[PDB]
Amino acid sequence: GGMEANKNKFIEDWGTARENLEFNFRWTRRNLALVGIFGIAIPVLVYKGIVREFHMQDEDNGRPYRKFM
Amino acid sequence: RRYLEDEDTPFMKTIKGATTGLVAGTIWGTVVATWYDVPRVERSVALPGLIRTFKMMGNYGLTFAAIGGVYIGVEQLLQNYRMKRDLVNGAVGGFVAGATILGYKGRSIKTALSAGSALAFTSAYIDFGGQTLKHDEGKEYAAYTTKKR
Amino acid sequence: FDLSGLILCPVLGSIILIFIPNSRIRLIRLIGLCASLITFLYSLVLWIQFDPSTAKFQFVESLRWLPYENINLNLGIDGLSFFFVILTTFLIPICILVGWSGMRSYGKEYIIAFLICEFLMIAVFCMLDLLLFYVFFESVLIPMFIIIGVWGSRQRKIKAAYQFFLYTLLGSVFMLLAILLILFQTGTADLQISLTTEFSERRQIFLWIAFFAAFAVKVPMVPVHIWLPEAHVEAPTAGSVILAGILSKLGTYGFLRFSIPMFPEATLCFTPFIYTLSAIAIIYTSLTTLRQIDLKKIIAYSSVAHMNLVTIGMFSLNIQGIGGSILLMLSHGLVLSALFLCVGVLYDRHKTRLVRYYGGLVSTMPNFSTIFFFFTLANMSLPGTSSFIGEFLISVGAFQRNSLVATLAALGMILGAAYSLWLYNRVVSGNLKADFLHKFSDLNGREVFIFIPFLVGVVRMGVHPKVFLDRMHTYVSNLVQHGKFN
Amino acid sequence: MNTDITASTKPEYPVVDRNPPFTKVVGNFSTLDYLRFVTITGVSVTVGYLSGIKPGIRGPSMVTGGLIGVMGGFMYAYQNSAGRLMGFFPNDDEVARHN
Amino acid sequence: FLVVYIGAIAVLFLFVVMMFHIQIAEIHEEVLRYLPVSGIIGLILWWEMFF
Amino acid sequence: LSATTIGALLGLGTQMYSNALRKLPYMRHPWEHVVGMGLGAVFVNQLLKWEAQVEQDLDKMLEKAKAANERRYI
Amino acid sequence: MFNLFLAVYPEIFIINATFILLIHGVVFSTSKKYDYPPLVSNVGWLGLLSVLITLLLLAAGAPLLTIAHLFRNNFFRRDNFTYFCQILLLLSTAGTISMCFDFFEQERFDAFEFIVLILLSTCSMLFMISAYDLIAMYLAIELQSLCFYVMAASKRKSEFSTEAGLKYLILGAFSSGILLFGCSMIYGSTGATHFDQLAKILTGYELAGARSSGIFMGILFIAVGSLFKITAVPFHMWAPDIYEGSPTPVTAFLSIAPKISIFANILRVFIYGSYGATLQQIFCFCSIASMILGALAAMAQTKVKRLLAYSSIGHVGYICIGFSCGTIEGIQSLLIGIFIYALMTIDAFAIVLALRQTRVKYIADLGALAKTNPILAITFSITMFSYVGIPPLAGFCSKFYLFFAALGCGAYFLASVGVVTSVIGCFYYIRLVKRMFFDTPRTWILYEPMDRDKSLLLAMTSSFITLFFLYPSPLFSVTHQMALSLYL
Amino acid sequence: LRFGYEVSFEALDKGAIEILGPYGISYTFRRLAERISQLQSGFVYHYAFAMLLGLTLFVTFFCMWDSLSSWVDNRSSFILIVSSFF
Amino acid sequence: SPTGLPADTSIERYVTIGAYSLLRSCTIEPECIIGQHSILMEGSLVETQSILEAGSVVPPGRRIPSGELWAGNPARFVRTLTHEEILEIPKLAVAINDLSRDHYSEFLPYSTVYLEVEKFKKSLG
Amino acid sequence: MDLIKYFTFSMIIFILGIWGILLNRRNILIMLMSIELMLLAVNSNFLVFSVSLDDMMGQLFALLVLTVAAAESAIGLAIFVITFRVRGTIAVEFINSIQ
Amino acid sequence: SSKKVSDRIVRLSAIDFEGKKHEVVGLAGHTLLKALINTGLIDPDSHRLEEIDACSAHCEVNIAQEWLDKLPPRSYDEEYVLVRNSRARVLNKHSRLGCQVLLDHNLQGMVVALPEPKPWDT
Ligand SMILES: [Fe+3]
């Protein structure tokens, strides 16, 4: 039956603006800082911590530290 | 192998790179000037067309020579500083040439980052291999010489 | 009762539908559904005759594809691919049952495309040849792209199909380079010889890098997950069901089968890399699922997070970790299919996806509310559910291997209990918005029946996962024991 | 002018004669070669008739097809007979006749 | 060469050229601009002849 | 499946594909379908026989290449 | 018929049939007794019959083509490689003739001289494939070149046809001059024209050195001429313009038939005679350029004929990677790729001629084809995916075997560039498939049904393409045998 | 909650990843394809010029390759090509 | 036509036209529904996605706006069309298309009446 | 010395045809003329090489190249005539409809 | 509120290449290309799909500067098509594609010019 939602123009515009955020990127200072912190620095720190955990396991086992990329 | 071939002291390397970049830029500028048509009002006259061609030759030669010289110089200085040659030794030199020379031409940081990344990837891509089209040496490709075993 | 027969069952129905006029929509629907159900029963009969003791591939069948160059077609199963075969064969009839009401507009091409996709899936999962496995791996690209483009809701389906095709093509092409290099090195593409042959450490690293790129295109990782939410949003509900419970599982299957045992040293070298990628993807994708406005996007990002949990559970090279990875693969296929079915039901009733319009569906759709609550619980991995079984086994393996990555993965529990609850409350709990939506209808008989097998499967695999676990311990043990000889 | 009849590939069957004359090859035509000639000529004539209906020249089209088919069928029959007589083909019957 | 090139092909070219009645400024271009590229290509070909 | 019946099925499918390609009914001119099945059967049989012959020729040429490379050694 | 001419029965029959067809067509088209009938259809049917008959002659007389080995050695040498190449060429010519029949009646193109030139050019390509000397090579190349000049400029009042004819004229004459200079340099610095003599003189000594600089230049110029003949990017600029301007049957014939003949000629002049790493390096650079610029330019095209031309350029680049490896597997891959590309091009141009009834020009014209002509939409999408290299279809077989030959080649750079280009150039095929299936244009271009001549050929080609992955052993074995028989 | 949209989605998923992914790739490939298509100017003189450059480059880089390799480097040549392509 | 537009009768795709429709110089845009006893005089156009019920007559030069339902012996607007009702026009068009396909299968390419006329000729002589 | 002078002259004629093609941008008949000059240089090279090498292949192939050049000149002037009649002018900017 | 078509009728004028004055009648919302095709001074088969991708400047019309101010300015795609598909690669600054000229009562009475027709067959 006639079950279609009563579409609101402003709600639809909000949805389209949300799904079209790729046009609004401008490499501003905030965007650059966020990319450099949460896109590079945090993954690098996580990788270093994981490698450190593996190397600590190697030291406790007495083996020779493993080789990672 | 390539290092063992010739001595090629770094200053001479840089001079040779700058000279060949200048030659290639001159050739490319001549090609571009002859490819692009003259305006309608300039069809009757020939001296303005020749002057425009010469200016394009000079511009392209100068920019290509600058790119080559900067790239080779940065690579040589990095090699001297690190006392060794690696993939990143010439990869950084390509980025500097694009960021400084091509970046100044575009008058924008984004072009410098874009052009520098493209040159750095190209320099590293060729240096990733042995700068050889074919990387297989065990294949014979031709049976000419007999062998005992 | 053979794998060749299993592969050929969709082909006969597909041909029959191709040679039937489009005006006989009732006959087309009935024949397609009958073929799908017959194939499902045939796969079940294959199940009641599976030996979980041996490590060799069970129903090996050889066909002469190329007499030279050793690229003969080998069809076989060992225990890991088997549940995926069953999952695809079960999920295909659900896709036909979904479009039952308006199938005349869809046409027979819809059922034909889904049957061809089923044929391709069974061919992929039943394969002991690397080159032919890649052939069907990239064959699955045609039907899904056509489905997304043709039966998409809006004009963004074109961009979604383009992104899907280009990403998968790039990955498959690099995999093809690696596979051809392996073929030239070994003299054959046979899986047994490829497993029993050595590779140089540099060669192992390069081949593993190519395979990882190819499979990480399929299983969404941090840089290459952005094509998946758009694909689910723009694909129809059945296409989303397939892409969520079938193709990503294909990718992780290919990765687990051809990367971990073939290149042990490379996997050990790159293990922290995938751990950090998976932890970052889980955290970031759960957090970006929290702030979403589209239902399809929410479940697609949940798919990304759970697939990254799967790939964080494989390199925990132990029985618990790998078994949990496989179990959560099956469970997430079922749960993603069910959640996308719920969202498709909502879209079919009310042609919108934004949760702003929805709210207070308890008063009008109580059966749908109960089903949605159960499947949000399954996505949340409540204890007593297959997703919980898989997630806890994965976390056990991750804690036995690397405590830091285990804790990072376990941080996903809090985030997955956040967006699931908050979405469920938005859509189902609250008061009706009569200005937006004022006509409602609860789940009908067809949809209720469609949801029945999902509930039964989830409950059976959660309460008593012994059958599924015991059907794969031998293969898991042999896979972990492949590299070593001690 | 010097002419050499030697072929690169050796015949796989006994050779009745390396360079049989044209009249001998024509006289070697068995019933199968005549069937070849007849079938080719008939195919050509039928094709010519069926294609010349639209232009309106049925007689001329059949005549042209007949010349083309006669040439092609005679060439094919001569080819088969010569290949048999030089041992390139399974010439059991004329090998027996020679023996 | 006389009979064919001088006779046949050259009377053909002459007939077609005169019958066209091509006017100036319809086929007209300054040659100074192409002098550098012509010189470079000719010098490359001459160097190859040298080698 | 036999080669003859595989070829018959292929020819029937090709004929019905051609019929459907011009918006004609699938089974228009059934005698053309019979001719198509016959042509497909003979095509598959001849293809298999010619494949066997060319495989024998390829084996012969591989043996020739092996002998030629064997003649390298002193 | 004296027994030496057993070696030339196919060519002699095709020449005599061409003469008979020309005489019949002229005498019954200049006839006032009738209404000056359009004899294009009758002459085309008779030419297709003649092509079939000479194909039968060449196929049945497999060992008889070798008769008078030393007598014909000056002009041409026939073996299994040339036998299979000529069989494929005759099949392609027959398909092109059959699929262009409906163009004649509907478009009123009623010049039987088109069919006469088809037959004469086919004989020229036969002579080229058999050719074993620097003179017969040039004669056959020039014969097909003049035939193709007349073919491209066939539509006299058409501005596009005249411009395409003039361009193809000038550029082909330039390439002929370059190839002639190369032949002259080789003759002057070698003393030899026969391929056997060139092989004997050249083997054992590399072409890159102080000695044999003239030989190197001659070989390079001949390679330049051959590369122009196959539309490599350094010399490709004619292919799109003439392919668009010339009538669609003419451009289909140009895209299908000359490729195999020129590539067999290249194999017999370069792989056998002047085999040396510098030629493979030249063709490696040409293949890189061909793939890269074909993909880049076809991404920006919006016309079906131009897109087909650039796809042909890219697939020639892939055939060039197969050549530039220059091994047994490399040559086998080259032959596999040529066969698959010829089949796919026949398929695509048959579909294009089917859509020519309503004068399809742009990619958008075939929009909403999934509704008006469903099975045609699926067929053309299958062809586009085959061009892409999707596994289940025939194009992927040639694709991965080319890449395998490149991996055993040692040319990792070449293989990586090829695969990146394969990913890049998928976009315009996908755009075509989108236009048929995904778009919902405001207005639709309804397409008239096909003719049976195109329909049967299209059905057979589509069945071969779709079901080739079930049985590629015959083609693989044949190409391997041809590559092995190139030398011994 | 802010990280879910301000960083993870807008700054990474719809930001750097997409700008350096499908969006920027699409724009760059569109402009590169347009520039390549500009080469086919429809001029017989342009086509003959392209043929002449092809022949001259082949001659210079193969026949004169001894002195050319003694002077220039492959890395430098390809870097100049890329810089010309911008 | 009275509207100076081209007067050829054009009926675009997905247009259902009832039993006793009297159409003259109409310009029916695609996806239209027209009931029986409907008359469309010269110069009339029914725009895309529109419905005219049974018995409606449009005067020459009168247009039926897109997305609307019209009725009455003089054409008059009744109510706007919801999207769900609009989407059903192609479904109706393809439904009568399927019924037409069902009707189509009963006719062989060539009639057998020539046998009857030959029998009549033989009976006469 | 004579061979050196003849080869130098032929190479200079080849380069001069190249220069004609290069300089004649808006002129097309002179481009065809430069192509014909290239053909003449090729013929002269073949003849002088035959004379120097005491081999008759150069003369044979020079005669064949003459025949081919004459035929291609006939065809080319046909194309020129039909083009000029179609567009009414020989200017290059009227022959740029395909791009 | 009779909802006739005379309100949607937009009447404009066109001078074709040889200078003959023509009267062109087209509906509002229907493009100038469609109006000219209906009038008969543009080949209907030359331009069928009213799309920028399918337009090869066969719908090009020169419009007066005092009329260019009444319709939206040329898009980048339109300018690119005009530049590429021209005798000389220049912009005429008075010509616009007939596909993108949406007729309306604001443009009613506009005078356009049809240049020399171009061939389109293959
Ligand atoms: Fe337009």
Question: At a CB cut-off of 8 Å and minimum separation 6, what does J80 contact?
Answer: E16, G166, J28, J29, J32, J90
Whether A35 sits inside 8 A of H16 (CB atoms) is yes
Q: How far is the CA of G106 from the centre of ligand 1 (A)?
A: 27
Question: Could you say which residues from 41 to 60 on chain A have a Cβ atom under 8 Å away from some Cβ of chain C?
Answer: 42-43, 46-47, 49-51, 53-54, 57
> Which residues lie closer than 8 Å to K5 by C-beta, 6 or more apart?
I3, I5, I43, I44, I45, I61, I62, I63, K27
Nearest-by-Cβ selection for J98 from G153, G160, G191 = G160
- Token digits of residue G296: 């880049």
Contact criterion met (CB below 8 Å) for I18 and I37: yes
Pick from G244, G308, G304, G248: which is nearest to G106 by CA?
A: G248
**CA atoms B99, B100, B103, B107: torsion sign:** positive
Q: Which residues of chain G make contact with B141, given a CB cutoff of 8 A?
A: 277, 326-327
Rounded CA-CA distance C134/C137 in Å is 5
- Tell how far CA B100 is from the center of its chain: 14
CB burial readout G36-53, b (16+ within 10 A) else e:
ebbbbbbbbbbbbbbbbb
K38 interfacial to chain I (CB closer than 8 Å)? yes
Question: CB J4: neighbour CB atoms within 10 A?
Answer: 8
Between chains, do B30 and E32 touch, taking CB under 8 Å as contact?
A: no
Residue K55 assigned ligand-binding role: yes
CB pairs under 8 A between A and H: 36
How many other CB atoms are found less than 10 A from the CB of residue J51? Answer: 14
- G407 interface with K at CB cutoff 8 Å: no
In degrees to the nearest 10, what's the CA dihedral of C147, C149, C150, C156? 130
Q: Which residue of K has its CA nearest to J94?
A: K87
Taking each helix axis from N to C end, the angle separating G412-424 and G394-407, rounded to the nearest 10 degrees, works out to 150
Q: Is F51 on the interface with C (CB under 8 A)?
A: no
What's the residue count for chain A? 69
**In sequence order, what are the residues at sequence separation of 6 or more whose Cβ sits closer than 8 angstroms to the Cβ of residue J54?**
none
How crowded is residue D56: how many other Cβ atoms within 10 Å of its Cβ?
A: 15
* Those residues with Cβ within 8 angstroms of residue G236's Cβ, 6 or more apart along the chain or in another chain: G290, G293, G294, G313
Who among J25, J36, J77 is closest to E16 (CB)?
J77
Asked if J75 and G146 count as a contact pair (C-beta separation under 8 A), the reply is yes
Solving technique for this entry? cryo-EM
Q: Of C257, C230, C237, C289, whose CA–CA distance to C418 is shortest? A: C289
- In order, the DSSP letters of K35-103 are HHHHHTSS-TTT--S-STTT--STTEEEE-HHHHTTSPPPPHHHHHHHHHSSSSSS--SSEEESSS-B-
Q: Which chains touch J (3+ CB pairs under 8 A)?
A: E, G, H, K
CB contact under 8 A, K87 and J94: yes
* Chain C residues 316-375 within an 8 A CB cutoff of chain A: 349-352, 354, 356-357
d(CA C14, CA G391): 20
- Put simply, the answer to whether I101 touches C21 (Cβ < 8 Å) is yes
- I12 touching chain K per CB within 8 A: no
CA dist list (Å): G409 to B19, C177, G190, G285, G329: 35, 13, 30, 15, 9
In terms of C-beta distances under 8 Å and separation of at least 24 residues, what long-range contacts does H19-25 make, across chains too? H19/A22, H19/A25, H19/A27, H21/C223, H21/C226, H22/C163, H22/C166, H22/C226, H22/C227, H23/A22
Helix/strand/coil percentages in chain C, nearest 5:
70, 0, 25
Residue whose C-alpha is closest to residue C85's, from C144, C13, C5 = C5
Q: Looking at beta carbons, which residues of chain F come within 8 Å of C67?
A: 55
Interchain CB distance below 8 Å, K53 and G245: no
Measured in whole angstroms, the distance separating CA B43 from the mean position of its chain's CA atoms is 35
Contact G63 D88 (CB under 8 A): yes
* Cα K4 → chain centroid: 25
Radius of gyration in angstroms for the set of CA atoms belonging to chain F, rounded to a whole number? 21
**Which two three-digit tokens encode residue G141?**
């190349």
Q: Which residues pair with K112 in a beta bridge?
A: K14, K63
CA of K46 relative to ligand 1 center, distance in Å: 10
The helix or strand, by DSSP H or E, that contains position C117, with its residue range, turns out to be: helix C108-125
Structure tokens at G124: 């020229």
User: Are C341 and C237 spatial neighbours (Cβ–Cβ below 8 Å)?
Assistant: yes
How far apart are alpha carbons J71 and J74 in whole angstroms? 5
B142 at interface of G, judged by CB pairs closer than 8 A: yes
- The chains found to touch I (3+ Cβ pairs under 8 angstroms) are A, C, K
Locus of tokens 């598909």: K85
CA atoms of J86 and G245, how far apart (whole Å): 14
Distance of residue F31 Cα from the nearest chain G Cα, in angstroms: 15
Burial class of residue D23 in the structure, from the number of CB atoms within 10 Å of its CB (0-12 exposed, 13-18 middle, 19+ buried): exposed
Q: How many CB pairs under 8 A join G and K?
A: 42
The answer to whether G146 faces chain J, any CB pair under 8 Å, is yes
> Which residues of chain G have a CB within 8 Å of the CB of H54?
224, 234-235
Distance B107 CA to ligand 1 centre (A): 38
| CA–CA gap between residue G334 and residue G328 (Å, rounded) | 10
Residue K50 CA, ligand 1 centroid: distance in Å? 6
Q: What are phi and psi of C65, to 5 degrees?
A: -85, -60
DSSP lists the bridge partners of residue H75 as none
Å between J82 CA and nearest CA of chain G = 7
- Interface test with chain B among F66, F70, F74, by most B beta carbons within 10 Å: F74
Pairing mode, strands I50-52 and I68-71: parallel
Cα separation of C205 and B80, whole Å? 31
Candidates H29, H30, H58, H74: best to mutate against G (most CBs of G within 10 A) is H58
| Kind plus residue range of the DSSP H or E element containing C75 | strand C73-75
Chains J and I touch (3+ CB pairs under 8 A): no
Of G394, G352, G165, the residue nearest G252 (C-alpha): G352
Residue among F38, D12, F54 at smallest CA distance from G87: F54
* Min Cα–Cα distance to chain H from C222, Å: 9
- Single out the residue of D17, E47, K93 nearest to residue H67, CA to CA: E47
User: Which chain A residue's Cα is nearest to H23?
Assistant: A22
Helices then strands (H, E): number in chain C?
Answer: 22, 2
- Sign of the CA dihedral with J58 first, then J59, J63, and J64 last: negative
Instruction: Give CA torsion, residues D37, D38, D43, D48, to 10 deg.
Output: 90
Q: Residue B120 — φ and ψ, nearest 5°? A: -65, -40
Q: Which residues in chain E are closer than 8 Å to B24, comparing Cβ atoms? A: none
Question: For residue J22, which residues of chain E lie inside 8 Å, CB to CB?
Answer: 34, 37-38, 41
- Does the CB of G249 have a partner CB in chain K at under 8 Å? no
Whole-number Å distance between alpha carbons of C248 and C251: 5
Closest CA in chain E for residue H62: E48
Nearest Cβ partner of G282 from H36, H39, H58?
H58
Q: Is G442 helix (H, G, I), strand (E, B) or coil?
A: coil
| Residue of H2, H9, H12, H30 best to disrupt the C interface, most CBs of C under 10 A | H9
Distance, CA of A69 to chain centre:
21
C190 beta partners: C129
Give the H or E element holding residue G378. helix G374-388
Contact with chain K for residue I77, Cβ under 8 A: yes
Beta-carbon separation of J92 and H44 below 8 A: yes
I102 touches chain C (CB under 8 A): yes
Q: Is K99 among the annotated ligand-binding positions? A: yes
- Interface of chain I against chain A, CB under 8 Å? 82-84
Does the beta carbon of A60 lie under 8 angstroms from any beta carbon of chain I? Answer: no
**CA G116, chain centre distance (Å):** 19
- The alpha carbon of K98 and the centre of ligand 1 are apart by a number of angstroms equal to 5
Distance from the E4 Cα atom to the nearest Cα atom in chain H, whole angstroms:
27
